[PDB]
Amino acid sequence: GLPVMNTPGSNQFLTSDDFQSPSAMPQFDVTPELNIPGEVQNLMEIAEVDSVVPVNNVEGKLDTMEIYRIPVQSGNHQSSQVFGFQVQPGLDNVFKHTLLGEILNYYAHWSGSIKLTFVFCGSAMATGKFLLAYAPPGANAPKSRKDAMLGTHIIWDVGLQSSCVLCIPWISQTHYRLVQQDEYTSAGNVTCWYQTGIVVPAGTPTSCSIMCFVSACNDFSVRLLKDTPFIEQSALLQ
Amino acid sequence: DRVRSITLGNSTITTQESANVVVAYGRWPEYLKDNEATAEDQPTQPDVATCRFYTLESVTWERDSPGWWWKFPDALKDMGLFGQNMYYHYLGRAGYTIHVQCNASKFHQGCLMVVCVPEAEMGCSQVDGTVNEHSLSEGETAKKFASTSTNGTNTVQSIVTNAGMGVGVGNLTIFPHQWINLRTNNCATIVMPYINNVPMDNMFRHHNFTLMIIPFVPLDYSSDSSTYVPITVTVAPMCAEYNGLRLATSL
Amino acid sequence: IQRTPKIQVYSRHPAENGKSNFLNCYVSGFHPSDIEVDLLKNGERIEKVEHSDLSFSKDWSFYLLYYTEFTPTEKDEYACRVNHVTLSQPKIVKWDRDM
Amino acid sequence: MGAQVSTQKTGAHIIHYTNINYYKDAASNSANRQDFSQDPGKFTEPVKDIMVKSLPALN
Amino acid sequence: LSLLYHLTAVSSPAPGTPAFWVSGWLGPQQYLSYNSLRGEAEPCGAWVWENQVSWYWEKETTDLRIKEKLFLEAFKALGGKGPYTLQGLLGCELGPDNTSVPTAKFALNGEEFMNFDLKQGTWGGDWPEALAISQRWQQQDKAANKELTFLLFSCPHRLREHLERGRGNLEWKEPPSMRLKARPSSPGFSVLTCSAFSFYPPELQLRFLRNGLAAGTGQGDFGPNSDGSFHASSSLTVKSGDEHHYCCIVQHAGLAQPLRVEL
Amino acid sequence: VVEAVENAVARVADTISSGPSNSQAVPALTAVETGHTSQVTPSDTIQTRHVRNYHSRSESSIENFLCRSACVYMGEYHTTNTDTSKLFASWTINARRMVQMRRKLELFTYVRFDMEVTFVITSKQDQGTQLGQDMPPLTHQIMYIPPGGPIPKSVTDYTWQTSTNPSIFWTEGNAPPRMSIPFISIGNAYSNFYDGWSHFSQNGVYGYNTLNHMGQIYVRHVNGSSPLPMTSTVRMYFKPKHVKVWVPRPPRLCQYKNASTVNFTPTNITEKRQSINYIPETVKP
């Protein structure tokens, strides 16, 4: 018949190909389609939803709800820092089990801006102001409010609106970053300091808490599928 | 802008400290259409005798309370004509309006999460075991989470950090949800349509969704305030439909 | 869901005085898994006693037999006590010399 | 012959391929891996009243 | 004639009590004994008189361990609290010359609730517990085929090989030992009693004769001994006089004569 | 005839330039109580430049995220033995025994897709007292049995006629076999989660096993040969296509325990560090 030649790559099974194939049930009538609410079309829709961050991950609090809330109180505590952590959305213990982190750990690269939302959960008679600061890489983490104020920061005043947003913008040399980060693709850190302190009247509890939420912006993207290192089995039937 | 009123049937709810209303996936409850049905007989639609606000029984928020959950339906199977229609039909369908109320003074503090989870399948405490229906639901009485790992027998793995489902609780915001921060609002409202892979289903055999209420920040006060703070839930069916009339079931 | 047992006493060899014999206490018709069965000599609860492995019948009825060695005597004869979950009283049936 | 010609996945800063279907069942075609559409507001802002991003959330 | 197996599993055993035990009966009597506290089968001692070299008596242990673990696992499919008890009746019987017929049924708390279906090799029933236990049993990924072989290619084989290896242990037939006696009763009557000792085959017919007139059957009680043979004993209340005429008729496979006994 | 197909490229949003501000607009203040997620970009809180972004969200589509082959079963079987049940391999079809695809599918509550199946079969010779033989290539039969069909009792059973069940015959040394299956469900979509029972009295079996009912696979040697016995191994690979999904869920945190239930052992939320302020120093002299 027609003369042909076989090129390399013949009779191989490549797991990520896509060819047509014969159907084992010819002329099958499928069930009609139903309009179910909540149809997903892109995983980047899931990463754009907030989720609580476990910032207080120390010994004795890994299996309690205490892992989610950041303590704060009244008096003179200006020399003390509130919290601080590294911006590694897919490698740091603080971020890797959130929605954003679980989506990232399926990919190798990422890029775009991030949002950290903060909510104050004291009584309605408490007042205070906080400084939230981001520092691009290239130096050690700041050790005083004076050092932290030199980066990208915002001053948040507690009132009726209970929430504030610290947007972390994209400032990098490359277009993407590794999800398994190293010295070469660092992203910086985030710290928090008292700006004026917490003042309360008589008859209230002493301590108050702050909570953190993390999500992605509308210019975020990922690429290069891989496997996730979190689930694992030893045998079949599991 | 924080006042709100909802009327259904001969029921009305008012509020003066409202946040907003969440509509689950941007879609409102509706009736089944002709080009997506499968059952052939004419359905019944009571329409004011069932679409109505029913009030469950309250729970007591304490210093150390893990949380509570209810299963829907089967929490409403004894509420008047909605439950009566439930006993006499084979298929039913309805959406819901959920309203949670909890108020406190300006000298208290706390924060609750109110979340509706579709098909919240739960796991037993003995890993090679099975669950009961009694340890899954109790009607209008709530089931209580636990602060530590449960051992028990036949009981759900109730520790609150895993939500009885093997996940992390801080990730439950992927579902339709609201917060009650005791310094901002005192009520939460969710409107949830009918969600299933079939157009209608039996209301006894299948738990459509679960309502979970979890305190993230515990309750706190100081030395003169009221120590008793209750939480109350109120549910209203919407666009209810029933098919397959026959004699009444038993249990 | 329970059944109350029924008891019958007999002996394999013919009941001839002086001629020793194997006495049999046959219980049947009860659906718990367990039972208590003793044989006594005018109150002398027999020490030398062996049983059979409890089986069940077509109606899932449990049956068993306690068989022992004895000597039929016009002076001393025997009885059989059975304790159960259904009966508030442990029943005593004494050795019939004819059945 | 019922051939479909469509563009290839390139970059930014001859370019289309050809396809023919050989089987009678649509379950036997190749994957539909060039369909891109978002709809995020369904999960990120499912509220009844519109929020305008420069006004206060409440009041 | 048939080969069958009684299996029993209890939910909460007492101290010193096995949680699972099996008995084996071929024809009208038993030849096996086994439980879960030791872990291997035993003979009865009067059937083959041949200690099979780990090849006929350990296949027994081989599949009895499997059935033990299935039965003890079945309880972890029920979510209920109450103490349970699972019973099983398995085996098969011969056809005319070939074509055996099997049987495999199970009971929960004394109620027949599921059985084995051969054309799809599945346990099945109507109750919810039947479906739960069936699902769990067949999820062990080999049990259906291992059971279906036991009902079509092992029990008929062992049955036929017992049919001709020790058939000299199937001719148990011995005439009984009869005790027709009298019982004093309330003033006006008297109770006749007719016994029969150590007769090997079960079938036995008891009927009372006044002088030459049938009087009925009485209340015939039947009980096996520790030997495989049986004991029968019937009673009947009759008149106070004319008691020396009653002469009941008994025929048996061991009796070559319609033995009517004198007082 | 030839038809042109036009497919739209979907790229991320650009960044606009922004100067100083002093006013009563407040994009950074909000209230998370409403369930709303804030729609704030960097050009609202800082001074930015103009950026033409060319990045694309094409690898995070559901079709590109789910359409890869993965092992879902592995089984062994012999050519001859003294057991008669180890002569063939048999199982029920589901994606719940290999955890990597289970976790990936269970990100959504409802799914609907066609499937593509590939098999990989290998053989080896049982190590015995003596080797040395000459054996032709082996042939294998793979039979798919829909729910309710008759079940083979052995390797010589009549049921292998495959008069109406679809079957595959494959001889060693060639390409791996492969076929396509459509969306075969009585519902309108498959269900990864089911919070319900099988009986109306609210008992029986609980969960996923109430709804699977999609058939079985049987695999056997066709030759019936090998005076010196061999042993084979078959591995199955699923790959979905033309996919639709509904109602996302949070990923699983705990390790699975079995294929039927969702039981788990309680685990921690994450791992520890030194304190709530600890950051390691990396710029050292």
Coordinates of N, CA and C in Angstrom, one line a residue, chain F residues 48-211:
Chain F
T48 N 2.7 53.0 42.1 CA 3.1 51.9 41.1 C 3.4 52.5 39.8
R49 N 4.1 51.7 39.0 CA 4.3 52.0 37.6 C 3.4 51.2 36.7
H50 N 3.4 51.5 35.4 CA 2.6 50.7 34.4 C 3.4 49.5 34.0
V51 N 2.7 48.3 34.0 CA 3.3 47.1 33.6 C 2.4 46.4 32.6
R52 N 2.9 45.9 31.5 CA 2.2 45.1 30.5 C 2.6 43.6 30.9
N53 N 1.6 42.9 31.5 CA 1.8 41.6 31.9 C 1.4 40.6 30.8
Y54 N 2.2 39.6 30.5 CA 2.0 38.6 29.5 C 1.8 37.2 30.0
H55 N 1.7 37.1 31.3 CA 1.5 35.8 31.9 C 0.1 35.2 31.6
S56 N 0.0 33.9 31.7 CA -1.2 33.2 31.3 C -1.6 32.1 32.3
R57 N -2.9 32.0 32.6 CA -3.4 31.0 33.5 C -3.9 29.8 32.8
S58 N -3.0 29.2 31.9 CA -3.5 28.1 31.1 C -3.2 26.7 31.7
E59 N -2.2 26.6 32.6 CA -1.9 25.4 33.2 C -2.6 25.1 34.4
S60 N -3.5 26.0 34.9 CA -4.3 25.7 36.1 C -5.8 25.5 35.7
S61 N -6.1 25.4 34.4 CA -7.4 24.9 34.0 C -7.6 23.5 34.6
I62 N -8.9 23.1 34.7 CA -9.2 21.8 35.2 C -8.8 20.7 34.2
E63 N -8.9 21.0 32.9 CA -8.5 20.0 31.9 C -7.0 19.7 32.0
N64 N -6.2 20.8 32.2 CA -4.8 20.6 32.3 C -4.3 20.1 33.6
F65 N -5.1 20.3 34.7 CA -4.8 19.9 36.0 C -5.1 18.4 36.2
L66 N -6.1 17.9 35.6 CA -6.6 16.5 35.9 C -6.2 15.5 34.8
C67 N -5.7 15.9 33.7 CA -5.6 15.0 32.5 C -4.2 14.4 32.4
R68 N -3.9 13.5 33.3 CA -2.6 12.8 33.3 C -2.9 11.4 33.8
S69 N -2.2 10.4 33.3 CA -2.4 9.0 33.6 C -1.8 8.7 35.0
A70 N -2.4 7.8 35.7 CA -1.9 7.4 37.0 C -2.4 6.0 37.4
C71 N -1.5 5.3 38.1 CA -1.8 3.9 38.5 C -3.0 3.9 39.5
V72 N -3.9 2.9 39.3 CA -5.0 2.8 40.2 C -5.2 1.4 40.7
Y73 N -4.4 0.4 40.1 CA -4.5 -0.9 40.6 C -3.2 -1.7 40.2
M74 N -2.8 -2.7 41.0 CA -1.8 -3.6 40.6 C -2.1 -5.0 41.1
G75 N -1.9 -6.0 40.2 CA -2.3 -7.3 40.6 C -1.5 -8.4 40.0
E76 N -1.4 -9.5 40.6 CA -0.6 -10.7 40.2 C -1.5 -11.9 39.9
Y77 N -1.0 -12.8 39.1 CA -1.6 -14.0 38.8 C -0.6 -15.0 38.1
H78 N -0.9 -16.3 38.2 CA 0.0 -17.3 37.8 C -0.5 -18.0 36.5
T79 N 0.3 -18.9 35.9 CA -0.1 -19.7 34.9 C -0.6 -21.1 35.4
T80 N 0.1 -21.6 36.4 CA -0.4 -22.8 37.1 C 0.0 -22.8 38.5
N81 N -0.9 -23.4 39.4 CA -0.7 -23.4 40.8 C -1.6 -24.5 41.4
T82 N -1.5 -24.6 42.7 CA -2.3 -25.6 43.4 C -3.4 -24.9 44.3
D83 N -3.9 -23.7 43.8 CA -4.9 -22.9 44.6 C -6.1 -22.7 43.8
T84 N -6.0 -22.5 42.5 CA -7.1 -22.3 41.5 C -7.8 -20.9 41.7
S85 N -7.5 -20.2 42.7 CA -7.9 -18.8 42.8 C -6.8 -17.8 42.4
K86 N -5.6 -18.2 42.5 CA -4.4 -17.4 42.1 C -4.1 -17.5 40.6
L87 N -5.0 -18.1 39.8 CA -4.8 -18.3 38.4 C -5.3 -17.1 37.6
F88 N -6.0 -16.2 38.2 CA -6.5 -15.0 37.5 C -6.5 -13.8 38.4
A89 N -6.7 -12.6 37.9 CA -6.8 -11.4 38.7 C -8.1 -10.8 38.5
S90 N -8.7 -10.2 39.6 CA -10.0 -9.7 39.5 C -10.1 -8.5 40.5
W91 N -10.9 -7.5 40.1 CA -11.1 -6.4 41.0 C -12.3 -5.5 40.5
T92 N -12.7 -4.6 41.4 CA -13.7 -3.6 41.1 C -13.1 -2.2 40.8
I93 N -13.8 -1.5 39.9 CA -13.2 -0.3 39.4 C -13.6 0.9 40.3
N94 N -12.5 1.6 40.8 CA -12.7 2.9 41.5 C -11.3 3.5 41.6
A95 N -11.3 4.8 41.8 CA -10.0 5.6 41.9 C -9.8 5.9 43.4
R96 N -9.7 4.9 44.2 CA -9.6 5.1 45.7 C -8.5 4.2 46.4
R97 N -7.7 3.5 45.6 CA -6.7 2.7 46.2 C -5.3 3.3 46.2
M98 N -5.0 4.1 45.2 CA -3.8 4.8 45.1 C -4.0 6.3 45.5
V99 N -3.4 6.7 46.5 CA -3.8 8.0 47.2 C -3.5 9.2 46.4
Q100 N -2.5 9.3 45.5 CA -2.2 10.5 44.9 C -3.3 11.0 44.0
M101 N -4.0 10.1 43.3 CA -5.1 10.6 42.5 C -6.4 10.7 43.3
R102 N -6.5 10.0 44.3 CA -7.7 10.1 45.2 C -7.7 11.6 45.8
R103 N -6.5 12.0 46.4 CA -6.5 13.3 46.9 C -6.7 14.4 45.9
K104 N -6.3 14.2 44.7 CA -6.5 15.2 43.6 C -7.9 15.2 43.1
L105 N -8.6 14.1 43.0 CA -10.0 14.1 42.6 C -10.9 14.7 43.7
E106 N -10.5 14.4 45.0 CA -11.4 14.8 46.1 C -11.3 16.3 46.4
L107 N -10.7 17.1 45.5 CA -10.8 18.6 45.7 C -12.2 19.1 45.3
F108 N -13.0 18.3 44.7 CA -14.3 18.8 44.3 C -15.4 17.8 44.7
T109 N -16.6 18.2 44.9 CA -17.7 17.4 45.4 C -18.3 16.5 44.2
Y110 N -18.5 17.2 43.1 CA -19.1 16.4 41.9 C -18.2 16.6 40.7
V111 N -18.0 15.4 40.0 CA -17.2 15.4 38.8 C -18.0 14.7 37.7
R112 N -17.6 15.0 36.5 CA -18.2 14.3 35.3 C -17.2 14.3 34.2
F113 N -16.8 13.1 33.6 CA -15.8 13.0 32.6 C -15.9 11.7 31.9
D114 N -15.3 11.6 30.7 CA -15.0 10.4 30.0 C -13.6 9.9 30.5
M115 N -13.3 8.7 30.3 CA -12.1 8.1 30.8 C -11.3 7.4 29.7
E116 N -10.0 7.2 29.9 CA -9.2 6.5 29.0 C -8.3 5.6 29.8
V117 N -8.2 4.3 29.4 CA -7.6 3.3 30.2 C -6.4 2.7 29.5
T118 N -5.3 2.5 30.2 CA -4.1 1.8 29.6 C -3.6 0.8 30.6
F119 N -3.2 -0.3 30.0 CA -2.7 -1.4 30.9 C -1.2 -1.6 30.6
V120 N -0.5 -2.1 31.6 CA 1.0 -2.5 31.5 C 1.1 -3.8 32.2
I121 N 1.5 -4.8 31.4 CA 1.6 -6.2 31.9 C 3.0 -6.7 31.7
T122 N 3.6 -7.3 32.8 CA 4.9 -7.9 32.7 C 4.8 -9.3 33.3
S123 N 5.8 -10.1 32.9 CA 5.9 -11.5 33.3 C 7.3 -11.8 33.8
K124 N 7.4 -12.9 34.5 CA 8.6 -13.5 35.0 C 8.5 -15.0 35.2
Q125 N 9.6 -15.6 35.3 CA 9.6 -17.1 35.5 C 9.9 -17.4 37.0
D126 N 9.0 -18.2 37.6 CA 9.2 -18.6 39.0 C 10.5 -19.3 39.2
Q127 N 11.3 -18.9 40.2 CA 12.5 -19.5 40.4 C 12.3 -20.9 41.0
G128 N 12.9 -21.9 40.3 CA 12.7 -23.3 40.7 C 14.0 -24.0 40.7
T129 N 13.9 -25.3 40.8 CA 15.1 -26.2 40.9 C 15.9 -26.2 39.7
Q130 N 15.4 -26.0 38.5 CA 16.1 -26.1 37.2 C 15.5 -25.2 36.2
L131 N 16.3 -24.5 35.4 CA 15.9 -23.6 34.4 C 16.1 -24.2 33.0
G132 N 15.9 -23.5 31.9 CA 16.3 -23.9 30.6 C 15.1 -24.4 29.8
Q133 N 14.6 -23.5 28.9 CA 13.4 -23.9 28.2 C 13.3 -22.9 27.0
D134 N 12.3 -23.0 26.1 CA 12.1 -22.2 25.0 C 10.6 -21.9 24.9
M135 N 10.2 -20.7 25.2 CA 8.7 -20.5 25.3 C 8.3 -19.4 24.4
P136 N 7.2 -19.6 23.7 CA 6.6 -18.6 22.8 C 6.1 -17.4 23.6
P137 N 5.8 -16.3 22.9 CA 5.3 -15.1 23.6 C 3.9 -15.4 24.2
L138 N 3.6 -14.8 25.3 CA 2.4 -15.0 26.0 C 1.3 -14.1 25.5
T139 N 0.0 -14.6 25.8 CA -1.1 -13.8 25.4 C -2.0 -13.7 26.7
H140 N -2.6 -12.5 26.8 CA -3.5 -12.2 28.0 C -4.8 -11.7 27.5
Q141 N -5.8 -12.1 28.3 CA -7.2 -11.6 28.0 C -7.7 -10.7 29.2
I142 N -8.3 -9.6 28.9 CA -8.8 -8.6 29.8 C -10.3 -8.5 29.5
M143 N -11.2 -8.8 30.5 CA -12.6 -8.8 30.3 C -13.2 -7.8 31.3
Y144 N -14.1 -6.9 30.8 CA -14.8 -6.0 31.6 C -16.2 -6.4 31.7
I145 N -16.7 -6.6 33.0 CA -18.0 -7.1 33.3 C -18.8 -6.0 33.9
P146 N -19.9 -5.6 33.2 CA -20.8 -4.5 33.8 C -21.5 -5.1 35.0
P147 N -22.1 -4.2 35.8 CA -22.8 -4.6 37.1 C -24.0 -5.5 36.8
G148 N -23.9 -6.7 37.3 CA -25.0 -7.7 37.1 C -24.7 -8.8 36.2
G149 N -23.5 -8.9 35.6 CA -23.2 -10.0 34.7 C -22.7 -11.2 35.4
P150 N -22.7 -12.3 34.7 CA -22.2 -13.6 35.3 C -20.7 -13.5 35.5
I151 N -20.2 -14.2 36.6 CA -18.9 -14.2 37.1 C -18.1 -15.4 36.7
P152 N -16.9 -15.4 36.2 CA -16.1 -16.6 35.9 C -15.8 -17.3 37.2
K153 N -15.9 -18.6 37.3 CA -15.5 -19.3 38.4 C -14.1 -19.9 38.4
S154 N -13.5 -19.9 37.2 CA -12.1 -20.4 37.1 C -11.6 -19.9 35.7
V155 N -10.4 -20.4 35.3 CA -9.8 -20.0 34.0 C -10.4 -20.8 32.9
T156 N -11.0 -21.9 33.1 CA -11.6 -22.7 32.0 C -13.1 -22.6 31.9
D157 N -13.7 -21.7 32.7 CA -15.1 -21.5 32.7 C -15.6 -21.0 31.3
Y158 N -16.8 -21.4 31.0 CA -17.4 -20.9 29.7 C -17.5 -19.4 29.6
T159 N -17.7 -18.7 30.8 CA -18.0 -17.3 30.8 C -17.0 -16.5 29.9
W160 N -15.8 -17.0 29.7 CA -14.8 -16.2 28.9 C -15.2 -16.2 27.4
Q161 N -16.3 -16.7 27.0 CA -16.7 -16.5 25.6 C -16.8 -15.0 25.2
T162 N -17.0 -14.1 26.1 CA -17.1 -12.7 25.9 C -18.1 -12.4 24.7
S163 N -19.2 -13.0 24.8 CA -20.2 -12.8 23.7 C -20.7 -11.4 23.6
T164 N -20.8 -10.7 24.8 CA -21.4 -9.4 24.8 C -20.5 -8.4 25.6
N165 N -19.8 -8.9 26.6 CA -18.9 -8.0 27.3 C -17.7 -7.7 26.4
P166 N -17.2 -6.4 26.5 CA -16.0 -6.1 25.7 C -14.7 -6.6 26.3
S167 N -13.9 -7.1 25.5 CA -12.7 -7.8 25.9 C -11.5 -7.4 25.1
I168 N -10.3 -7.6 25.6 CA -9.0 -7.3 24.9 C -8.2 -8.5 24.9
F169 N -7.6 -8.8 23.8 CA -6.5 -9.8 23.6 C -5.2 -9.2 23.3
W170 N -4.2 -9.5 24.1 CA -2.9 -8.8 23.9 C -1.8 -9.7 24.0
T171 N -0.8 -9.7 23.1 CA 0.4 -10.5 23.1 C 1.6 -9.7 23.5
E172 N 2.5 -10.3 24.2 CA 3.6 -9.6 24.8 C 4.6 -9.1 23.7
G173 N 5.2 -7.9 24.0 CA 6.1 -7.3 23.0 C 5.6 -6.2 22.2
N174 N 4.3 -5.9 22.3 CA 3.7 -4.9 21.5 C 3.4 -3.6 22.3
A175 N 2.7 -2.7 21.7 CA 2.3 -1.5 22.5 C 1.4 -1.9 23.6
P176 N 1.3 -1.1 24.7 CA 0.3 -1.4 25.7 C -1.1 -1.2 25.2
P177 N -2.0 -2.0 25.7 CA -3.4 -1.8 25.2 C -4.0 -0.6 25.8
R178 N -5.1 -0.1 25.1 CA -5.7 1.2 25.5 C -7.1 1.3 25.0
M179 N -8.0 1.8 25.8 CA -9.4 2.0 25.3 C -10.0 3.2 26.0
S180 N -11.2 3.6 25.5 CA -11.9 4.8 26.0 C -13.3 4.3 26.5
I181 N -13.7 5.0 27.6 CA -15.0 4.7 28.2 C -15.8 6.0 28.4
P182 N -17.1 6.1 28.1 CA -17.8 7.3 28.3 C -18.3 7.5 29.7
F183 N -19.1 8.5 29.9 CA -19.6 8.8 31.3 C -20.8 7.9 31.6
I184 N -20.5 6.8 32.3 CA -21.5 5.8 32.5 C -22.0 5.9 34.0
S185 N -23.0 6.8 34.2 CA -23.6 6.9 35.5 C -25.1 7.1 35.4
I186 N -25.8 6.6 36.4 CA -27.2 6.8 36.4 C -27.6 8.2 36.9
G187 N -26.7 8.9 37.7 CA -26.9 10.2 38.1 C -26.5 11.2 37.0
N188 N -26.5 12.5 37.4 CA -26.0 13.5 36.4 C -24.5 13.8 36.6
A189 N -23.9 13.2 37.6 CA -22.4 13.3 37.9 C -22.0 12.3 38.9
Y190 N -20.7 11.9 38.9 CA -20.2 11.1 39.9 C -20.1 11.9 41.2
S191 N -20.0 11.1 42.3 CA -20.0 11.7 43.6 C -18.8 11.2 44.4
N192 N -17.9 12.1 44.8 CA -16.8 11.6 45.7 C -17.2 11.5 47.1
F193 N -18.3 12.2 47.5 CA -18.7 12.2 48.9 C -20.2 12.0 48.9
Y194 N -20.7 11.2 49.9 CA -22.1 11.0 50.0 C -22.4 10.8 51.5
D195 N -23.1 11.8 52.1 CA -23.6 11.8 53.5 C -25.0 11.3 53.6
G196 N -25.0 9.9 53.4 CA -26.3 9.3 53.5 C -26.2 7.8 53.7
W197 N -27.3 7.1 53.7 CA -27.3 5.7 53.9 C -27.9 5.0 52.7
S198 N -27.9 3.6 52.8 CA -28.5 2.8 51.7 C -30.0 2.4 52.0
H199 N -30.3 2.2 53.2 CA -31.7 1.9 53.6 C -32.4 3.1 54.1
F200 N -33.7 3.1 54.0 CA -34.5 4.3 54.4 C -34.6 4.4 56.0
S201 N -34.4 3.3 56.7 CA -34.4 3.4 58.1 C -33.1 4.0 58.7
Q202 N -32.3 4.6 57.9 CA -31.1 5.2 58.3 C -30.1 4.2 58.9
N203 N -29.8 3.1 58.2 CA -28.8 2.1 58.5 C -28.5 1.3 57.3
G204 N -27.7 0.3 57.5 CA -27.1 -0.4 56.4 C -25.6 -0.1 56.2
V205 N -25.3 0.4 55.0 CA -23.9 0.9 54.8 C -24.0 2.4 54.6
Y206 N -22.9 3.0 55.0 CA -22.8 4.5 55.0 C -21.7 4.9 54.0
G207 N -22.0 5.9 53.2 CA -21.0 6.6 52.4 C -20.9 6.3 51.0
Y208 N -19.6 6.2 50.5 CA -19.3 6.2 49.1 C -19.8 4.9 48.4
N209 N -19.7 3.7 49.1 CA -19.9 2.4 48.5 C -21.4 2.2 48.1
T210 N -22.3 3.1 48.5 CA -23.7 3.0 48.1 C -23.9 3.4 46.6
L211 N -23.0 4.0 46.0 CA -23.2 4.6 44.7 C -22.2 4.2 43.6

